[PDB]
Amino acid sequence: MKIGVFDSGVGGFSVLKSLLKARLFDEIIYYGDSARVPYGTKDPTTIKQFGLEALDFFKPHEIELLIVACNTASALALEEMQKYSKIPIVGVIEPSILAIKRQVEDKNAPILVLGTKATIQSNAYDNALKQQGYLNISHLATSLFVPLIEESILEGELLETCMHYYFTPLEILPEVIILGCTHFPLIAQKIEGYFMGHFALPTPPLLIHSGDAIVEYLQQKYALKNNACTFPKVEFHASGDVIWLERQAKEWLKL
Amino acid sequence: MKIGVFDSGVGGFSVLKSLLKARLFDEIIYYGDSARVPYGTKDPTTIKQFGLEALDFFKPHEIELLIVACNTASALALEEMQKYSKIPIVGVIEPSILAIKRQVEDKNAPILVLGTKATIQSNAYDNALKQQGYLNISHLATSLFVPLIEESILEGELLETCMHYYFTPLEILPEVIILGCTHFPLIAQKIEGYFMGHFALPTPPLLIHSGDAIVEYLQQKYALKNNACTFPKVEFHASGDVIWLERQAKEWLKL
Ligand SMILES: CC(C)Cn1c(=O)n(C)c(=O)c2c(-c3cncn3C)n(Cc3cccc4ccccc34)nc21
Ligand SMILES: CC(C)Cn1c(=O)n(C)c(=O)c2c(-c3cncn3C)n(Cc3cccc4ccccc34)nc21
Ligand SMILES: N[C@H](CCC(=O)O)C(=O)O
Ligand SMILES: N[C@H](CCC(=O)O)C(=O)O
Protein backbone atom coordinates (compact mmCIF):
# COMPACT_ATOMS: atom_id res chain seq x y z
CA MET A 1 0.00 0.00 0.00
CA LYS A 2 1.19 3.57 -0.69
CA ILE A 3 0.27 6.11 2.01
CA GLY A 4 0.83 9.73 3.03
CA VAL A 5 1.96 10.95 6.42
CA PHE A 6 1.28 14.61 7.19
CA ASP A 7 2.69 16.67 9.99
CA SER A 8 3.41 20.29 10.74
CA GLY A 9 7.08 19.50 10.45
CA VAL A 10 9.83 17.06 11.64
CA GLY A 11 7.87 16.09 14.84
CA GLY A 12 5.91 13.53 12.91
CA PHE A 13 9.07 11.46 12.96
CA SER A 14 7.87 10.03 16.29
CA VAL A 15 4.96 8.49 14.46
CA LEU A 16 6.87 7.56 11.24
CA LYS A 17 9.33 5.62 13.45
CA SER A 18 6.59 3.39 14.83
CA LEU A 19 5.21 2.92 11.34
CA LEU A 20 8.63 1.98 9.94
CA LYS A 21 9.50 -0.42 12.78
CA ALA A 22 6.18 -2.18 12.28
CA ARG A 23 6.89 -2.52 8.51
CA LEU A 24 3.32 -1.67 7.57
CA PHE A 25 3.83 0.09 4.24
CA ASP A 26 5.76 -0.43 1.02
CA GLU A 27 5.75 3.26 0.24
CA ILE A 28 5.36 6.41 2.34
CA ILE A 29 5.16 10.04 1.27
CA TYR A 30 5.99 12.31 4.28
CA TYR A 31 4.96 15.97 4.15
CA GLY A 32 6.05 18.38 6.83
CA ASP A 33 4.50 21.85 6.62
CA SER A 34 7.63 23.17 8.21
CA ALA A 35 7.32 26.73 6.88
CA ARG A 36 4.37 27.24 9.22
CA VAL A 37 5.25 25.06 12.20
CA PRO A 38 4.15 25.11 15.05
CA TYR A 39 0.43 24.62 14.60
CA GLY A 40 -0.20 24.22 18.34
CA THR A 41 -0.04 27.90 19.16
CA LYS A 42 -2.61 28.86 16.55
CA ASP A 43 -6.40 29.19 16.10
CA PRO A 44 -8.82 26.55 14.81
CA THR A 45 -9.76 28.31 11.57
CA THR A 46 -6.09 28.70 10.59
CA ILE A 47 -5.26 25.02 11.36
CA LYS A 48 -8.37 23.66 9.53
CA GLN A 49 -7.30 25.55 6.48
CA PHE A 50 -3.71 24.23 6.86
CA GLY A 51 -5.12 20.69 6.86
CA LEU A 52 -7.13 21.31 3.68
CA GLU A 53 -4.07 22.65 2.03
CA ALA A 54 -2.02 19.55 2.93
CA LEU A 55 -4.69 17.54 1.11
CA ASP A 56 -3.77 19.34 -2.13
CA PHE A 57 -0.12 18.52 -1.64
CA PHE A 58 -0.93 14.79 -1.67
CA LYS A 59 -3.11 14.71 -4.80
CA PRO A 60 -0.38 13.99 -7.43
CA HIS A 61 0.98 11.12 -5.20
CA GLU A 62 -2.00 8.82 -5.54
CA ILE A 63 -1.85 7.75 -1.93
CA GLU A 64 -4.50 5.28 -0.72
CA LEU A 65 -4.71 6.50 2.90
CA LEU A 66 -3.47 9.64 4.71
CA ILE A 67 -2.03 9.53 8.21
CA VAL A 68 -2.19 12.75 10.13
CA ALA A 69 0.74 12.33 12.53
CA CYS A 70 0.11 15.74 14.06
CA ASN A 71 -2.02 15.63 17.18
CA THR A 72 -2.93 19.37 16.72
CA ALA A 73 -4.12 18.91 13.14
CA SER A 74 -5.79 15.62 14.30
CA ALA A 75 -7.69 17.52 17.03
CA LEU A 76 -8.83 20.39 14.79
CA ALA A 77 -8.65 19.70 11.03
CA LEU A 78 -9.45 16.10 10.61
CA GLU A 79 -13.25 16.36 10.24
CA GLU A 80 -12.76 19.02 7.51
CA MET A 81 -10.04 17.11 5.68
CA GLN A 82 -12.19 13.90 5.70
CA LYS A 83 -15.18 15.83 4.34
CA TYR A 84 -13.29 16.70 1.09
CA SER A 85 -11.13 13.50 0.78
CA LYS A 86 -12.16 10.30 -0.99
CA ILE A 87 -9.34 8.26 0.63
CA PRO A 88 -9.39 7.56 4.33
CA ILE A 89 -7.62 9.89 6.68
CA VAL A 90 -6.48 8.55 10.03
CA GLY A 91 -5.53 10.83 12.90
CA VAL A 92 -3.66 10.08 16.12
CA ILE A 93 -6.39 10.82 18.71
CA GLU A 94 -8.96 8.07 18.02
CA PRO A 95 -6.35 5.32 17.92
CA SER A 96 -5.16 6.45 21.36
CA ILE A 97 -8.69 6.24 22.69
CA LEU A 98 -8.86 2.59 21.46
CA ALA A 99 -5.52 1.81 23.04
CA ILE A 100 -6.67 3.30 26.37
CA LYS A 101 -9.79 1.09 26.23
CA ARG A 102 -7.62 -2.02 25.86
CA GLN A 103 -5.13 -1.02 28.53
CA VAL A 104 -7.27 0.85 31.10
CA GLU A 105 -10.16 -1.34 32.41
CA ASP A 106 -10.72 0.93 35.39
CA LYS A 107 -13.02 3.72 34.05
CA ASN A 108 -12.16 5.81 37.09
CA ALA A 109 -8.40 5.80 36.64
CA PRO A 110 -7.22 9.44 36.58
CA ILE A 111 -6.08 10.14 33.02
CA LEU A 112 -4.00 13.26 32.31
CA VAL A 113 -4.02 14.55 28.70
CA LEU A 114 -0.88 16.57 27.64
CA GLY A 115 -0.89 18.53 24.40
CA THR A 116 -0.34 21.82 22.65
CA LYS A 117 -2.69 24.65 23.60
CA ALA A 118 -4.74 24.20 20.45
CA THR A 119 -5.04 20.42 21.10
CA ILE A 120 -6.00 20.92 24.76
CA GLN A 121 -8.49 23.76 24.08
CA SER A 122 -10.29 21.57 21.48
CA ASN A 123 -11.04 18.95 24.18
CA ALA A 124 -10.87 16.30 21.43
CA TYR A 125 -9.28 13.87 23.82
CA ASP A 126 -11.62 14.53 26.83
CA ASN A 127 -14.76 14.27 24.68
CA ALA A 128 -13.76 11.01 23.06
CA LEU A 129 -12.71 9.64 26.49
CA LYS A 130 -16.08 10.56 28.14
CA GLN A 131 -18.03 9.02 25.29
CA GLN A 132 -16.27 5.72 26.08
CA GLY A 133 -17.18 5.93 29.76
CA TYR A 134 -14.16 7.55 31.42
CA LEU A 135 -14.94 9.60 34.60
CA ASN A 136 -11.65 11.10 35.84
CA ILE A 137 -10.20 13.11 32.90
CA SER A 138 -7.72 15.99 33.45
CA HIS A 139 -5.88 18.04 30.77
CA LEU A 140 -2.83 20.25 30.53
CA ALA A 141 -1.29 22.41 27.83
CA THR A 142 2.40 21.92 28.26
CA SER A 143 3.26 24.33 25.45
CA LEU A 144 6.87 24.99 26.23
CA PHE A 145 7.67 21.35 25.91
CA VAL A 146 7.59 21.66 22.10
CA PRO A 147 10.33 24.34 21.68
CA LEU A 148 12.44 22.85 24.52
CA ILE A 149 12.39 19.59 22.59
CA GLU A 150 13.14 21.36 19.30
CA GLU A 151 16.23 22.85 20.99
CA SER A 152 17.27 19.43 22.31
CA ILE A 153 16.60 20.28 25.94
CA LEU A 154 15.94 16.58 26.71
CA GLU A 155 17.36 16.55 30.20
CA GLY A 156 18.86 18.63 32.92
CA GLU A 157 17.73 21.57 35.02
CA LEU A 158 15.95 23.58 32.37
CA LEU A 159 13.77 20.62 31.37
CA GLU A 160 13.26 19.73 35.06
CA THR A 161 12.31 23.30 35.95
CA CYS A 162 9.85 23.42 33.01
CA MET A 163 8.12 20.14 33.96
CA HIS A 164 7.91 21.34 37.50
CA TYR A 165 6.36 24.65 36.35
CA TYR A 166 3.58 22.76 34.50
CA PHE A 167 3.06 19.78 36.84
CA THR A 168 3.27 21.32 40.37
CA PRO A 169 -0.19 22.94 40.06
CA LEU A 170 -1.84 19.57 39.37
CA GLU A 171 -4.27 18.45 42.03
CA ILE A 172 -4.65 14.91 40.67
CA LEU A 173 -1.86 12.35 40.35
CA PRO A 174 -2.41 10.61 37.06
CA GLU A 175 -2.31 6.80 36.62
CA VAL A 176 -2.35 7.37 32.80
CA ILE A 177 -0.73 10.24 30.86
CA ILE A 178 -1.51 10.68 27.21
CA LEU A 179 1.51 12.02 25.20
CA GLY A 180 -0.88 13.93 22.91
CA CYS A 181 1.81 15.76 20.91
CA THR A 182 4.42 14.51 18.34
CA HIS A 183 7.28 15.85 20.43
CA PHE A 184 6.51 14.50 23.87
CA PRO A 185 7.74 10.86 23.31
CA LEU A 186 11.30 12.29 23.34
CA ILE A 187 10.83 13.21 26.98
CA ALA A 188 8.64 10.20 27.96
CA GLN A 189 11.04 8.74 30.53
CA LYS A 190 11.81 12.23 32.03
CA ILE A 191 8.07 12.73 32.53
CA GLU A 192 8.03 9.21 34.15
CA GLY A 193 10.94 10.07 36.34
CA TYR A 194 9.34 13.38 37.27
CA PHE A 195 6.24 11.69 38.78
CA MET A 196 8.33 8.87 40.32
CA GLY A 197 10.77 11.38 41.83
CA HIS A 198 8.09 13.71 43.15
CA PHE A 199 5.63 11.17 44.53
CA ALA A 200 5.82 7.78 46.24
CA LEU A 201 4.70 5.37 43.48
CA PRO A 202 5.55 1.69 43.05
CA THR A 203 5.29 2.17 39.21
CA PRO A 204 5.15 5.23 36.93
CA PRO A 205 1.91 6.32 35.36
CA LEU A 206 1.12 4.43 32.11
CA LEU A 207 2.30 6.52 29.12
CA ILE A 208 0.26 6.49 25.93
CA HIS A 209 2.40 6.99 22.77
CA SER A 210 0.47 8.18 19.62
CA GLY A 211 2.70 6.19 17.23
CA ASP A 212 2.31 2.82 18.86
CA ALA A 213 -1.46 3.40 19.24
CA ILE A 214 -1.98 4.22 15.56
CA VAL A 215 0.16 1.21 14.59
CA GLU A 216 -2.24 -1.06 16.55
CA TYR A 217 -5.23 0.56 14.81
CA LEU A 218 -3.85 0.34 11.34
CA GLN A 219 -3.02 -3.43 11.81
CA GLN A 220 -6.50 -4.24 13.06
CA LYS A 221 -8.64 -1.89 10.80
CA TYR A 222 -6.73 -2.57 7.55
CA ALA A 223 -5.42 -6.16 8.27
CA LEU A 224 -1.98 -4.60 7.79
CA LYS A 225 0.91 -6.79 8.54
CA ASN A 226 4.42 -6.63 9.63
CA ASN A 227 5.69 -7.96 6.42
CA ALA A 228 5.66 -5.13 3.97
CA CYS A 229 9.09 -4.99 2.39
CA THR A 230 12.44 -4.83 4.17
CA PHE A 231 13.39 -1.61 2.41
CA PRO A 232 10.28 0.67 2.16
CA LYS A 233 10.44 3.62 -0.27
CA VAL A 234 10.05 6.91 1.75
CA GLU A 235 10.08 10.42 0.26
CA PHE A 236 10.30 13.58 2.30
CA HIS A 237 8.63 16.84 1.31
CA ALA A 238 8.40 20.15 3.18
CA SER A 239 7.20 23.71 2.76
CA GLY A 240 10.38 24.90 4.56
CA ASP A 241 13.87 23.39 4.13
CA VAL A 242 13.34 19.90 2.73
CA ILE A 243 17.08 19.16 2.57
CA TRP A 244 17.29 19.75 6.34
CA LEU A 245 14.34 17.44 6.82
CA GLU A 246 15.93 14.73 4.65
CA ARG A 247 19.20 15.22 6.65
CA GLN A 248 17.16 14.66 9.83
CA ALA A 249 15.59 11.44 8.37
CA LYS A 250 19.04 10.16 7.46
CA GLU A 251 20.49 10.85 10.88
CA TRP A 252 17.51 9.72 13.08
CA LEU A 253 15.55 7.27 10.94
CA LYS A 254 18.42 5.72 8.84
CA LEU A 255 16.75 6.80 5.54
CA MET B 1 1.89 60.14 6.06
CA LYS B 2 0.60 56.60 5.76
CA ILE B 3 3.12 53.77 6.43
CA GLY B 4 3.23 50.03 6.97
CA VAL B 5 4.73 47.95 9.76
CA PHE B 6 5.50 44.26 9.09
CA ASP B 7 6.44 41.54 11.57
CA SER B 8 6.11 37.75 11.91
CA GLY B 9 3.20 38.29 14.45
CA VAL B 10 2.50 40.37 17.58
CA GLY B 11 6.06 40.87 18.68
CA GLY B 12 6.34 43.90 16.38
CA PHE B 13 4.30 45.68 19.02
CA SER B 14 7.60 46.43 20.76
CA VAL B 15 8.62 48.51 17.73
CA LEU B 16 5.18 49.97 17.26
CA LYS B 17 5.05 51.22 20.84
CA SER B 18 8.21 53.27 20.17
CA LEU B 19 6.82 54.58 16.83
CA LEU B 20 3.61 55.68 18.55
CA LYS B 21 5.34 57.44 21.42
CA ALA B 22 7.41 59.39 18.90
CA ARG B 23 4.33 60.71 16.93
CA LEU B 24 6.13 60.24 13.67
CA PHE B 25 3.24 59.05 11.44
CA ASP B 26 -0.40 59.94 10.96
CA GLU B 27 -1.49 56.46 9.87
CA ILE B 28 0.04 53.00 10.32
CA ILE B 29 -1.05 49.72 8.76
CA TYR B 30 0.34 46.87 10.95
CA TYR B 31 0.59 43.41 9.40
CA GLY B 32 1.66 40.29 11.39
CA ASP B 33 2.12 36.98 9.51
CA SER B 34 0.94 35.21 12.63
CA ALA B 35 -0.28 32.02 10.82
CA ARG B 36 3.41 31.30 10.13
CA VAL B 37 5.09 32.72 13.26
CA PRO B 38 7.86 32.22 14.32
CA TYR B 39 10.32 33.13 11.53
CA GLY B 40 13.36 32.79 13.88
CA THR B 41 13.51 29.00 13.69
CA LYS B 42 13.48 28.87 9.86
CA ASP B 43 15.82 29.27 6.83
CA PRO B 44 16.84 32.10 4.47
CA THR B 45 14.81 30.88 1.45
CA THR B 46 11.63 30.43 3.44
CA ILE B 47 12.12 33.77 5.19
CA LYS B 48 13.00 35.69 1.99
CA GLN B 49 9.77 34.57 0.43
CA PHE B 50 7.65 35.41 3.50
CA GLY B 51 8.99 38.95 3.16
CA LEU B 52 8.20 39.18 -0.56
CA GLU B 53 4.66 37.97 0.26
CA ALA B 54 4.35 40.77 2.83
CA LEU B 55 5.05 43.32 -0.02
CA ASP B 56 2.03 41.90 -1.81
CA PHE B 57 -0.16 42.30 1.16
CA PHE B 58 0.63 46.01 1.44
CA LYS B 59 -0.10 46.87 -2.25
CA PRO B 60 -3.82 47.86 -1.96
CA HIS B 61 -3.09 49.89 1.17
CA GLU B 62 -1.03 52.57 -0.64
CA ILE B 63 1.71 52.97 1.95
CA GLU B 64 4.65 55.27 1.46
CA LEU B 65 7.21 53.46 3.54
CA LEU B 66 7.40 50.04 5.10
CA ILE B 67 9.09 49.32 8.45
CA VAL B 68 10.15 45.69 8.90
CA ALA B 69 9.83 45.49 12.62
CA CYS B 70 10.99 41.83 12.69
CA ASN B 71 14.68 41.38 13.36
CA THR B 72 14.55 38.01 11.65
CA ALA B 73 12.87 39.32 8.51
CA SER B 74 15.26 42.33 8.62
CA ALA B 75 18.21 39.95 8.69
CA LEU B 76 17.13 37.53 6.00
CA ALA B 77 14.50 39.18 3.73
CA LEU B 78 15.37 42.91 3.67
CA GLU B 79 17.66 42.99 0.61
CA GLU B 80 15.20 40.94 -1.43
CA MET B 81 12.31 43.12 -0.29
CA GLN B 82 14.28 46.28 -1.23
CA LYS B 83 15.36 44.82 -4.59
CA TYR B 84 11.68 44.68 -5.65
CA SER B 85 9.99 47.48 -3.67
CA LYS B 86 9.13 50.93 -5.12
CA ILE B 87 8.92 52.42 -1.64
CA PRO B 88 11.62 52.72 0.95
CA ILE B 89 11.82 49.72 3.30
CA VAL B 90 13.52 50.22 6.69
CA GLY B 91 14.46 47.24 8.88
CA VAL B 92 15.67 47.13 12.50
CA ILE B 93 19.28 46.08 12.10
CA GLU B 94 20.92 49.09 10.37
CA PRO B 95 19.41 51.61 12.80
CA SER B 96 20.77 49.63 15.75
CA ILE B 97 24.24 49.64 14.12
CA LEU B 98 24.12 53.44 13.72
CA ALA B 99 22.76 53.85 17.33
CA ILE B 100 25.79 51.91 18.59
CA LYS B 101 28.11 53.90 16.31
CA ARG B 102 26.80 57.06 18.02
CA GLN B 103 26.92 55.93 21.67
CA VAL B 104 30.01 53.71 21.68
CA GLU B 105 33.33 55.31 20.55
CA ASP B 106 35.40 52.53 21.98
CA LYS B 107 35.93 50.05 19.12
CA ASN B 108 37.03 47.39 21.57
CA ALA B 109 33.90 47.51 23.74
CA PRO B 110 32.53 43.95 24.07
CA ILE B 111 29.22 43.95 22.22
CA LEU B 112 26.92 41.01 22.66
CA VAL B 113 24.21 40.30 20.01
CA LEU B 114 21.19 38.34 21.09
CA GLY B 115 18.69 37.12 18.48
CA THR B 116 16.68 34.19 17.15
CA LYS B 117 18.61 31.26 15.60
CA ALA B 118 18.06 32.61 12.07
CA THR B 119 19.08 36.23 12.97
CA ILE B 120 22.30 35.11 14.70
CA GLN B 121 23.11 32.56 12.01
CA SER B 122 22.90 35.29 9.31
CA ASN B 123 25.59 37.31 11.10
CA ALA B 124 23.70 40.37 9.83
CA TYR B 125 24.64 42.27 13.02
CA ASP B 126 28.29 41.10 13.19
CA ASN B 127 28.97 42.04 9.55
CA ALA B 128 27.51 45.44 9.94
CA LEU B 129 29.41 46.09 13.21
CA LYS B 130 32.71 44.88 11.72
CA GLN B 131 32.31 47.31 8.78
CA GLN B 132 31.82 50.05 11.30
CA GLY B 133 35.25 49.24 12.79
CA TYR B 134 34.15 47.18 15.88
CA LEU B 135 36.61 44.51 16.96
CA ASN B 136 34.97 42.73 19.94
CA ILE B 137 31.71 41.09 19.00
CA SER B 138 29.99 38.05 20.42
CA HIS B 139 26.67 36.56 19.51
CA LEU B 140 24.18 34.30 21.11
CA ALA B 141 21.02 32.64 19.72
CA THR B 142 18.75 32.80 22.72
CA SER B 143 16.08 30.88 20.93
CA LEU B 144 13.79 29.84 23.90
CA PHE B 145 13.30 33.43 25.05
CA VAL B 146 10.74 33.89 22.26
CA PRO B 147 8.27 31.05 23.36
CA LEU B 148 8.84 31.84 27.06
CA ILE B 149 7.91 35.49 26.40
CA GLU B 150 4.93 34.44 24.37
CA GLU B 151 3.74 32.41 27.36
CA SER B 152 4.31 35.40 29.61
CA ILE B 153 7.28 33.80 31.39
CA LEU B 154 8.53 37.27 32.23
CA GLU B 155 10.11 36.51 35.62
CA GLY B 156 10.60 33.72 38.13
CA GLU B 157 12.69 30.54 38.17
CA LEU B 158 11.98 29.26 34.67
CA LEU B 159 13.24 32.56 33.08
CA GLU B 160 16.25 32.73 35.44
CA THR B 161 17.19 29.07 34.51
CA CYS B 162 16.68 29.75 30.80
CA MET B 163 18.93 32.82 31.00
CA HIS B 164 21.50 30.80 33.01
CA TYR B 165 21.46 28.13 30.31
CA TYR B 166 22.28 30.68 27.53
CA PHE B 167 24.43 33.13 29.48
CA THR B 168 26.70 30.86 31.58
CA PRO B 169 29.02 29.64 28.70
CA LEU B 170 29.86 33.28 27.75
CA GLU B 171 33.57 34.09 27.86
CA ILE B 172 33.24 37.96 27.51
CA LEU B 173 31.64 40.47 29.95
CA PRO B 174 29.48 42.70 27.64
CA GLU B 175 29.40 46.48 27.83
CA VAL B 176 26.75 46.47 25.01
CA ILE B 177 23.80 44.01 24.59
CA ILE B 178 21.73 44.18 21.40
CA LEU B 179 18.11 43.12 21.97
CA GLY B 180 18.05 41.76 18.48
CA CYS B 181 14.53 40.34 18.49
CA THR B 182 11.05 41.97 18.86
CA HIS B 183 10.35 39.97 21.97
CA PHE B 184 13.49 40.74 24.03
CA PRO B 185 12.51 44.22 25.34
CA LEU B 186 9.88 42.47 27.49
CA ILE B 187 12.77 40.97 29.58
CA ALA B 188 15.38 43.73 29.15
CA GLN B 189 15.54 44.50 32.87
CA LYS B 190 15.76 40.74 33.67
CA ILE B 191 18.66 40.37 31.29
CA GLU B 192 20.46 43.36 32.80
CA GLY B 193 19.76 41.93 36.21
CA TYR B 194 21.30 38.56 35.32
CA PHE B 195 24.59 40.16 34.18
CA MET B 196 24.72 42.59 37.18
CA GLY B 197 23.92 39.76 39.64
CA HIS B 198 26.28 36.98 38.38
CA PHE B 199 29.24 39.03 37.36
CA ALA B 200 31.38 41.85 38.66
CA LEU B 201 30.09 44.45 36.26
CA PRO B 202 30.97 48.03 37.25
CA THR B 203 27.78 49.58 35.72
CA PRO B 204 24.82 48.24 33.71
CA PRO B 205 25.53 47.34 30.13
CA LEU B 206 24.16 49.64 27.40
CA LEU B 207 21.01 47.90 26.09
CA ILE B 208 20.09 48.51 22.42
CA HIS B 209 16.30 48.46 21.80
CA SER B 210 15.35 47.94 18.15
CA GLY B 211 12.33 50.29 18.31
CA ASP B 212 14.12 53.23 19.99
CA ALA B 213 16.92 52.78 17.48
CA ILE B 214 14.64 52.83 14.43
CA VAL B 215 12.89 55.95 15.71
CA GLU B 216 16.21 57.74 16.00
CA TYR B 217 17.03 56.67 12.46
CA LEU B 218 13.67 57.68 11.01
CA GLN B 219 13.78 61.08 12.60
CA GLN B 220 17.25 61.86 11.30
CA LYS B 221 17.09 60.18 7.87
CA TYR B 222 13.70 61.37 6.88
CA ALA B 223 13.77 64.67 8.73
CA LEU B 224 10.72 63.66 10.79
CA LYS B 225 9.97 66.01 13.65
CA ASN B 226 7.44 64.28 16.05
CA ASN B 227 4.59 66.47 15.03
CA ALA B 228 2.13 63.91 13.60
CA CYS B 229 -1.47 63.85 14.71
CA THR B 230 -2.06 63.27 18.42
CA PHE B 231 -4.01 60.02 17.82
CA PRO B 232 -2.90 58.25 14.67
CA LYS B 233 -5.13 55.92 12.71
CA VAL B 234 -3.77 52.38 13.16
CA GLU B 235 -5.09 49.25 11.57
CA PHE B 236 -4.19 45.67 12.50
CA HIS B 237 -4.05 42.76 10.03
CA ALA B 238 -2.74 39.20 10.34
CA SER B 239 -2.69 35.90 8.52
CA GLY B 240 -4.48 34.51 11.56
CA ASP B 241 -5.71 35.15 15.05
CA VAL B 242 -6.58 38.75 13.80
CA ILE B 243 -9.28 39.13 16.49
CA TRP B 244 -6.73 38.19 19.05
CA LEU B 245 -4.30 40.63 17.52
CA GLU B 246 -6.85 43.51 17.71
CA ARG B 247 -7.51 42.61 21.37
CA GLN B 248 -3.86 42.76 22.15
CA ALA B 249 -3.59 46.21 20.50
CA LYS B 250 -6.48 47.61 22.62
CA GLU B 251 -5.22 46.01 25.89
CA TRP B 252 -1.58 46.85 25.58
CA LEU B 253 -1.12 49.82 23.16
CA LYS B 254 -4.21 51.88 24.20
CA LEU B 255 -5.66 51.59 20.61
C1 LIG C 1 11.96 11.16 16.91
C2 LIG C 1 12.86 10.01 17.13
C3 LIG C 1 12.31 9.10 16.03
C4 LIG C 1 14.30 10.33 16.71
N1 LIG C 1 14.96 11.40 17.50
C5 LIG C 1 15.52 11.15 18.70
O1 LIG C 1 15.37 10.01 19.11
N2 LIG C 1 16.17 12.07 19.45
C6 LIG C 1 16.76 11.69 20.79
C7 LIG C 1 16.35 13.33 19.01
O2 LIG C 1 16.90 14.19 19.73
C8 LIG C 1 15.76 13.66 17.66
C9 LIG C 1 15.73 14.77 16.87
C10 LIG C 1 16.25 16.12 17.10
C11 LIG C 1 17.18 16.78 16.31
N3 LIG C 1 17.31 18.00 16.86
C12 LIG C 1 16.47 18.14 17.88
N4 LIG C 1 15.83 16.99 18.11
C13 LIG C 1 14.80 16.71 19.12
N5 LIG C 1 15.05 14.49 15.74
C14 LIG C 1 14.70 15.49 14.75
C15 LIG C 1 13.64 16.33 15.51
C16 LIG C 1 13.82 17.66 15.67
C17 LIG C 1 12.94 18.51 16.37
C18 LIG C 1 11.77 18.03 16.94
C19 LIG C 1 11.52 16.67 16.83
C20 LIG C 1 10.38 16.15 17.41
C21 LIG C 1 10.07 14.82 17.34
C22 LIG C 1 10.92 13.97 16.63
C23 LIG C 1 12.06 14.48 16.05
C24 LIG C 1 12.43 15.81 16.12
N6 LIG C 1 14.59 13.19 15.82
C25 LIG C 1 15.04 12.68 16.94
C1 LIG D 1 4.13 46.93 23.78
C2 LIG D 1 4.36 45.66 24.59
C3 LIG D 1 5.67 45.84 25.30
C4 LIG D 1 3.23 45.69 25.62
N1 LIG D 1 3.14 44.46 26.39
C5 LIG D 1 3.70 44.36 27.62
O1 LIG D 1 4.28 45.31 28.11
N2 LIG D 1 3.68 43.29 28.35
C6 LIG D 1 4.30 43.32 29.69
C7 LIG D 1 3.03 42.19 27.94
O2 LIG D 1 3.13 41.17 28.62
C8 LIG D 1 2.51 42.15 26.56
C9 LIG D 1 2.03 41.18 25.73
C10 LIG D 1 1.75 39.76 25.99
C11 LIG D 1 0.53 39.15 25.89
N3 LIG D 1 0.71 37.83 26.11
C12 LIG D 1 1.98 37.57 26.33
N4 LIG D 1 2.67 38.74 26.25
C13 LIG D 1 4.09 38.92 26.41
N5 LIG D 1 1.82 41.78 24.48
C14 LIG D 1 1.40 41.14 23.25
C15 LIG D 1 2.61 40.19 22.98
C16 LIG D 1 2.36 38.85 23.03
C17 LIG D 1 3.36 37.84 22.86
C18 LIG D 1 4.67 38.25 22.59
C19 LIG D 1 4.98 39.62 22.50
C20 LIG D 1 6.30 40.03 22.19
C21 LIG D 1 6.59 41.36 22.07
C22 LIG D 1 5.60 42.34 22.21
C23 LIG D 1 4.33 41.95 22.54
C24 LIG D 1 3.95 40.60 22.69
N6 LIG D 1 2.19 43.10 24.58
C25 LIG D 1 2.59 43.33 25.81
N1 LIG E 1 2.97 18.26 15.72
C1 LIG E 1 2.36 19.10 16.80
C2 LIG E 1 3.45 19.76 17.59
C3 LIG E 1 4.18 20.86 16.79
C4 LIG E 1 3.18 21.95 16.46
O1 LIG E 1 2.60 22.58 17.39
O2 LIG E 1 2.93 22.13 15.23
C5 LIG E 1 1.44 18.22 17.61
O3 LIG E 1 1.63 17.00 17.53
O4 LIG E 1 0.56 18.70 18.36
N1 LIG F 1 9.87 38.85 15.38
C1 LIG F 1 11.01 37.87 15.40
C2 LIG F 1 10.84 37.04 16.67
C3 LIG F 1 9.64 36.07 16.51
C4 LIG F 1 9.84 35.14 15.35
O1 LIG F 1 10.72 34.26 15.50
O2 LIG F 1 9.20 35.31 14.30
C5 LIG F 1 12.30 38.62 15.53
O3 LIG F 1 12.27 39.84 15.86
O4 LIG F 1 13.37 38.02 15.35
UniProtKB/Swiss-Prot annotation, chains A, B:
Please verify whether the record's keywords include Cell wall biogenesis/degradation: yes
Q: Can you state which reaction this protein catalyses?
A: L-glutamate = D-glutamate
Protein source organism: Helicobacter pylori (strain J99 / ATCC 700824)
Q: Where is the active site?
A: C70, C181
- BP terms from Gene Ontology: cell wall organization; peptidoglycan biosynthetic process; regulation of cell shape
Keywords, ordered alphabetically: Cell shape, Cell wall biogenesis/degradation, Isomerase, Peptidoglycan synthesis
Name this protein carries in UniProt: Glutamate racemase
State how it assembles: Homodimer.
Query: EC number(s) in its UniProt entry?
Result: 5.1.1.3
Any one Gene Ontology molecular-function term assigned to this protein's record: identical protein binding
